[PDB]
Design a protein around this ligand. Sequence first.
Ligand SMILES: N[C@@H](CCC(=O)O)C(=O)O
Ligand SMILES: N[C@@H](CCC(=O)O)C(=O)O
Lengths: 221, 221
Amino acid sequence: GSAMALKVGVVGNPPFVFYGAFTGISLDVWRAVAESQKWNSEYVRQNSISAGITAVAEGELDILIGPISVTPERAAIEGITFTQPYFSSGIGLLIPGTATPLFRSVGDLKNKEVAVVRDTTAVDWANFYQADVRETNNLTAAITLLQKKQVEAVMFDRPALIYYTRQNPNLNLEVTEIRVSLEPYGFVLKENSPLQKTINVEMLNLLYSRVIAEFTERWLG
Amino acid sequence: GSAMALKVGVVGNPPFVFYGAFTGISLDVWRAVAESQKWNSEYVRQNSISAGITAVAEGELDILIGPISVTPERAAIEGITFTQPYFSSGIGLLIPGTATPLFRSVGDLKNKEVAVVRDTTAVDWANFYQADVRETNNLTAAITLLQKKQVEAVMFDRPALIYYTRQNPNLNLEVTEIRVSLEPYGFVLKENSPLQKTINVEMLNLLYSRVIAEFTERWLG
Ligand SMILES: N[C@@H](CCC(=O)O)C(=O)O
Ligand SMILES: N[C@@H](CCC(=O)O)C(=O)O
């Protein structure tokens, strides 16, 4: 097809998004949608979810894809609308194997030095649970702070934390059973976008046919 | 407030919707949204989800509330759009206590006489799993068919089935551990509705603040 390409902003971490050029669960979901419509895409990495959402509202992007948590604050941003969610995720905690007795509930987060990645929902949850929040630029940085000793835990999306531990079994880090929150992931479109219905219908088809589950199993099963 | 009332279509069964005038989890969610905006409502019972969706598309209703499963086929209906989902439900099976050994998986549904309520997602799931589908007008009718012997099971939303058994412990009916599907519940608005963002933001607030969980616990905890 020689039709104008949709400008797709990409943000997020493994296993939902990997940067080569772009792969992961979120990319698999988007590509299945685009292919079903024979649409062309032009991918543009975004610095953060906030930057990406503004780019969609300002018309610089047609859609923002990735493991984007659907939150009240984000849904309130003028000019944008979320698609139906395609994944139900949880925000968890990564800690040293020796610290497992210390982290048994969210109440245990109070006053503990917790590392979080900037512009992620974890920043707000860590503040809400009264932790000693230490913001970092990326997950690697947050985990490097855990490997040193500045922090006692890293709060971030559970699938990303589990994926990380699986690439570094040598580290002896553990993802607690604690679920700080349950959050749905969705894509972001311009409000009243003429693409909204088509995208929702296709994402729902992928969801109900268990195709999204297959994508997830390929990266985290 | 003397502002024009929003026309709210109501459809569904307990514990999400009860008909006096209207109560239940779905009504609690909607009322919390309306109250936060100081909106006036005018409730109109709908015969079915399909009828209700058409009424929203045709402008007869401003919104359709209830335990409405967000499906690809419904999302594809012209002129409407679903809100963000507010509940994650499962479609289950109600069977006699003596039949528990017979229903251990969806594969066991093949050729079994299954009762379903017309215009519910269960009709499609029962057909998909190759059951001997017997459509009925309402849940009471489907269960009355189970109490007789025309059917070997009733396929319907799990929370409604559990609620039913709890009002009739004398019956000795059991809700199997089988989950035929996992489906999100949402409300239906007119496509590009000027109410969409406000409604989504409020429903998300209720969700994240655990208020929706409190509503559910009040009727099924
Ligand atoms: N789900 C997180 C982002 C997770 C990630 O960057 O992988 C958020 O929406 O803030
Ligand atoms: N969730 C079902 C309806 C359940 C009910 O009527 O209570 C559907 O969307 O078909």
